[PDB]
């Protein structure tokens, strides 16, 4: 029992594209002549850009941060540890899911579309029908490939900018009580305990006090 | 595990307070949420972030937390407020997991 | 002297994506938008079995070819299936007028009832 | 957002039951989804939940080892399967959504639920 | 935003600036007041009008296009004509929507 | 006035333009000063053949 | 850039006259447009102007209350309407373009004009 059928076999999927057969019966995905169509949702993987943050002055990523995309790593007399940033990760997740949904909703489903038969004295209309089919297939393949190619680059630049914005925020908060030593870290001129680190991460660092 | 009084009763038009007492591992270091459940219906969120109210909740419901014990307060008691009230928290030390309160039955007269 | 650092995420994924400026870029997360797998069977469409002619074609099925005696009972279907070896049509030589138009007409019929028009 | 579960289930001791939850809107979600059960005359209990994009799943220690939570993203569906079913597993089941992408105590939207009986 | 200026470290806009898009607000002993910046606003206006004109000029005007009639023995060509019409309509709808969506960002 | 973006929906903007028209007058009217030909109860065959 | 106006107008006291100005090139302009009139044997006089995108309109105190300047952007046209017309309103009218997007004293391109008579 199935919902989509092709002369080669039945299809059981929810993806928006397929490359099995142009002839379908039922509710089937759009047919393209492509071989690969993968859409990026995460950032560049460096286990061990336009804005120069990812693989720029921050050379590599952290495998110890598991609950987010961007975050902090602290170390003081109490101890060291990682901590993800929730607001930036939430905004990035909202944007990426919105982008994927927009991509999905712009490609409508394919309905029943079967071939026709012509006699030996009807070659002109047969050729016209074949030409129409081939032209539409080529146009849609081009559209899909171009869309994926552009959106991947946009996503990567999005993440690269999101990292640098957080870096600039933290730098602005630590005007003169911290020293910029490169690689994305700041070294404190005073004693910053757990409460001070929490205040730095929250966004309400008390500059006059320290 | 959080503990609440088994039942509280009051006349209509009065104010009631329900306590949720835990330990330093659940309430003393994390926020507390308050849910309301009617017979045959799924629980409905009343209070989050220990004092914040979602859209649509009447002003007369309020909440607070003082150390290891949270409190929920209802004013202008009505006949339709007779339901079960639960306190939930994010216990996190061995393996973090949501913990609900023991439950408190609020009866109107 | 106490320090705070800013960084990003990394895992052990090995999925790659293509960009207009670079190829084979490894990313942390991705999704696949293309399907290329089937089961290789002809199967019922929403609880209704298809009509498989077999050795016969449309002309042999409707005309009542002696080789299609197994098709005299079918009355409902979801789609019609034909084979490249379907060659039992009009046994007596001749011309079938507007055969492709009849095929196009039957391509939008779900059931019929066969009755004796002249006993 | 509306969360709808499947129909009622009546099974036998030692069996395995898989239930589903479908959410309205776009197929891809930006919030975590958890599963909560309630016994007759008892308070609610939390099994576990699933996180978007990252895909990590968390379970309670009581149900650890015999509950599995998966998600079909393109269909917008989330499945929870319970195995080694016993007599006490009869209950009333809901799928609840959170405010953010992380599993927490704050569930703001609940489904109608489905009943599981042995 | 990608550059963190609007709704970034400058949280809100000014309703007192009426003659431009970007400007200054000063305050000293003489007094306070707003003043728009002319060069940046002019360059932005030039760019935006150029973008709108480019969008307009790429879509040509539709001429006369009416339907056809077919008999009861000409269903194949009728279906082909309908398929052609629907395909072209879908393609152009997709193009317009995608163009607007990208240019807004 | 709000616009739609691939990353966000319903964004209020200071200025915008509308590129779609969805209004007509609901009448059959002359095209550049020449009136149309309205057959009415007849068709082309009855118009050319001279139907009574 | 070329600015062209409509034809000559002959009207009656107490009427209202609407004139138009069309500019070549792209339908959308990056410059403001003003309206200037001249009496026989007199110097030019300025009524008001319109600003692109922002759409604000400015008028002179003499003609304030009985002149209206509008713009059709997709057609690339600018309309100026004068009401409560009188005997002295007969004049020679031009539409003039400015160098920038703001109304100022520097008008660099003028049209041929049209004559309004009572
Ligand atoms: C249904 O179709 C089959 C073919 O798929 C028909 O069988 C074929 O009938 C033709 C009749 O001309 C046979 O050709 C003749 O074969 C004999 C064999 O001795 C040969 O001597 C003749 O010169 C001629 O070539 C053909 O062999 C035969 N094929 C098979 C596989 O049997 C069948 O008659 C059709 N039934 C109908 C129309 O009712
Ligand atoms: C954290 O930041 C929020 C943002 O307004 C503020 O309300 C809260 O008081 C801050 N908490 C601390 C401990 O600084
Ligand atoms: C990545 O590591 C996890 C455990 O941290 C493991 O379950 C997974 O199989 C690994 N992936 C690959 C591709 O090796
Ligand atoms: C990308 O990787 C595939 C698989 O290893 C390889 O066939 C292809 O040549 C690579 N592309 C480039 C541009 O190197
Ligand atoms: C945008 O606004 C319209 C009108 O209020 C509303 O119907 C629509 O749901 C909104 N879009 C989103 C994504 O909320």
Residue of E nearest to F6 (CA): E101
| Dist CA B26 CA B102 (whole Å) | 14
Residues C61, C71 contacting (CB under 8 angstroms) = yes
Interchain proximity A116–E76, CB inside 8 Å:
yes
Q: Is E4 part of the contact surface with chain A (CB cutoff 8 Å)?
A: yes
Query: Do E and D have ≥3 inter-chain CB pairs under 8 A?
Result: no
Give residues with Cβ within 8 angstroms of D87, minimum separation 6. Answer: D13, D118
Nearest-neighbour CA in chain E from G89: distance (Å): 32
Give which of A86, A101, A106 to mutate to test D binding, by max D Cβ within 10 Å: A101
Residue nearest to ligand 2 atom 2, measured at CA? A202
Ligand nearest to the CA of A35: 4
Q: What is the torsion angle, in degrees rounded to the nearest 10, for the CA atoms of residue D55, residue D61, residue D63 and residue D68?
A: 20
Q: Is C34 part of the contact surface with chain D (CB cutoff 8 Å)?
A: no
| Dist CA C89 CA C66 (whole Å) | 10
Ligand nearest to the CA of A201: 2
Interchain proximity A153–C100, CB inside 8 Å:
no
Nearest to A169 by CA among A78, A91, A60, A88: A88
Which residues make beta-bridge pairs with B25? Answer: none
> Among C64, C67, C69, C84, which residue has the most ligand 1 atoms within 8 Å of its CB, making it the best to mutate?
C67
> How much distance in Å is there from the Cα of A142 to the middle of ligand 4?
21
| Dist CA A115 CA A76 (whole Å) | 73
Give kind and range of the element (H or E) at residue C8.
Answer: strand C3-8
A-chain residues within 8 Å CB-CB of E79?
A: 116
G-chain residues within 8 Å CB-CB of F16?
A: none
Residue nearest to ligand 2 atom 9, measured at CA? A204
E-chain residues within 8 Å CB-CB of A161?
A: 2-4
Interchain proximity A99–F9, CB inside 8 Å:
no
| Residue B86 DSSP code | E
D28 C-beta neighbours (distance < 10 Å), count: 21
> Among F4, F9, F11, F13, which residue has the most ligand 5 atoms within 8 Å of its CB, making it the best to mutate?
F9
Nearest to D80 by CA among D37, D35, D116: D35
| Dist CA C101 CA C79 (whole Å) | 18
Give kind and range of the element (H or E) at residue C103.
Answer: helix C99-106
E34 C-beta neighbours (distance < 10 Å), count: 15
Residues touching ligand 1 (Cβ under 6 Å) are: C 65-67, 87-88, 91
User: Is the minimum distance from the CB of C19 to ligand 4 under 6 angstroms?
Assistant: no
B-chain residues within 8 Å CB-CB of D113?
A: 42
Rounded to a whole number of angstroms, the CA Rg of chain D reads: 13
| Dist CA A99 CA A93 (whole Å) | 10
Residues A54, A160 contacting (CB under 8 angstroms) = yes
> How much distance in Å is there from the Cα of F10 to the middle of ligand 5?
7
> How much distance in Å is there from the Cα of A205 to the middle of ligand 2?
10
> How much distance in Å is there from the Cα of E93 to the middle of ligand 5?
21
Task: Give the 3-state secondary structure of residue A74.
Answer: strand
> How much distance in Å is there from the Cα of C17 to the middle of ligand 4?
11
The alpha carbon of E44 is separated from its chain's Cα centroid by a whole number of angstroms, namely 15
| Dist CA D87 CA D14 (whole Å) | 9
Give kind and range of the element (H or E) at residue E39.
Answer: helix E38-57
CA-C24 nearest atom, ligand 4? 1
Residues A184, A52 contacting (CB under 8 angstroms) = no
Give residues with Cβ within 8 angstroms of A21, minimum separation 6. Answer: A6, A7, A8, A31
Q: Which residues of C touch E (CB under 8 A)?
A: 98, 100-101, 104-105
D40-74 as b/e: b if 16+ CB within 10 A: eeebbbbbbbbbbbbeebbbbeebeeebebebebb
Residues G53, G113 contacting (CB under 8 angstroms) = no
Residues D72, A14 contacting (CB under 8 angstroms) = yes
- ∠ CA C21-C24-C27, rounded to 5°: 100
- The token pair at F43 is 């068709």
Residues D5, D114 contacting (CB under 8 angstroms) = yes
Resolution of this deposited model, Å? 2.6
Residue of F nearest to E97 (CA): F4
| Dist CA A187 CA E35 (whole Å) | 41
Q: Match 């728009």 to its residue by tokens.
A: E36
G-chain residues within 8 Å CB-CB of F17?
A: 73
């Amino acid at each position: 029992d199935t919902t989509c059928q092709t002369p080669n076999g039945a299809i059981n999927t929810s993806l928006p594209f397929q490359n099995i057969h142009p002839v379908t019966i039922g509710e089937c995905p759009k047919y393209v002549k492509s071989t690969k169509l993968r859409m990026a949702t995460g950032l560049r993987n460096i286990p061990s850009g336009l804005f120069g943050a990812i693989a720029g002055f921050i050379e590599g990523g952290w495998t110890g941060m598991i609950d987010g995309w961007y975050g902090y790593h602290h170390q003081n007399e109490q101890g060291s540890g990682y901590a993800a940033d929730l607001k930036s990760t939430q905004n990035a997740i909202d944007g990426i899911t919105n982008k994927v949904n927009s991509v999905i909703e712009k490609m409508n489903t394919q309905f029943t579309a079967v071939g026709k038969e012509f006699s030996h004295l009807e070659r002109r209309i047969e050729n016209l029908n074949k030409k129409v089919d081939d032209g539409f297939i080529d146009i849609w393949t081009y559209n899909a490939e171009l869309l994926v190619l552009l959106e991947n680059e946009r996503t990567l630049d999005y993440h690269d900018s999101n990292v640098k914005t957080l870096y600039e925020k933290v730098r602005s908060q630590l005007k003169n009580n911290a020293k910029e030593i490169g690689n994305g870290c700041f070294e404190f001129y005073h004693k910053c305990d757990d409460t001070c680190m929490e205040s730095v991460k929250n966004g309400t660092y008390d500059y006059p006090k320290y | 595990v959080l503990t609440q009084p088994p039942s509280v009763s009051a006349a209509p038009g009065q104010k009631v307070t329900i306590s949720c007492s835990g330990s330093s591992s659940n309430i003393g270091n994390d926020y507390v949420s308050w849910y309301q459940q009617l017979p045959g219906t799924a629980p409905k969120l009343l209070i989050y972030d220990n004092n914040k109210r979602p859209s649509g909740i009447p002003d007369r419901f309020s909440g607070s937390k003082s150390g290891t014990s949270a409190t929920l307060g209802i004013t202008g008691l009505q006949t339709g407020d007779e339901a079960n009230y639960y306190c939930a928290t994010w216990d996190r030390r061995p393996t973090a997991y949501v913990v609900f309160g023991g439950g408190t039955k609020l009866t109107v007269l | 002297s106490d320090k705070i650092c800013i960084g990003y995420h990394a895992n052990n994924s090995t999925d790659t994506v293509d960009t207009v400026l670079e190829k084979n870029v490894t990313v942390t997360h991705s999704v696949n938008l293309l399907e290329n797998k089937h089961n290789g069977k002809l199967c019922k469409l929403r609880g209704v079995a298809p009509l498989h002619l077999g050795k016969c074609n449309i002309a042999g099925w409707l005309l009542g070819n002696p080789e299609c005696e197994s098709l005299a009972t079918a009355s409902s279907w979801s789609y019609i299936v034909e084979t490249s070896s379907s060659n039992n049509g009009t046994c007596y030589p001749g011309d079938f007028i507007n055969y492709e138009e009849l095929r196009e007409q039957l391509s939008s019929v779900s059931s019929f009832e066969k009755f004796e028009i002249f006993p | 957002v509306q969360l709808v579960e499947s129909g009622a289930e009546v099974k036998k001791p030692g069996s395995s039951v898989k239930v589903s939850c479908k959410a309205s809107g776009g197929p891809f979600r930006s919030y975590a989804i958890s599963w909560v059960r309630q016994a007759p005359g008892q308070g609610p209990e939390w099994m576990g939940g699933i996180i978007p994009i990252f895909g990590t799943t968390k379970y309670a220690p009581k149900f650890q080892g015999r509950v599995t939570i998966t998600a079909d993203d393109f269909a917008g569906t989330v499945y929870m399967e319970l195995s080694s079913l016993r007599s006490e597993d009869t209950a009333m089941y809901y799928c609840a959504k959170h405010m953010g992408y992380q599993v927490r105590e704050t569930m703001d939207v609940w489904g109608k639920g489905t009943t599981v009986t042995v």
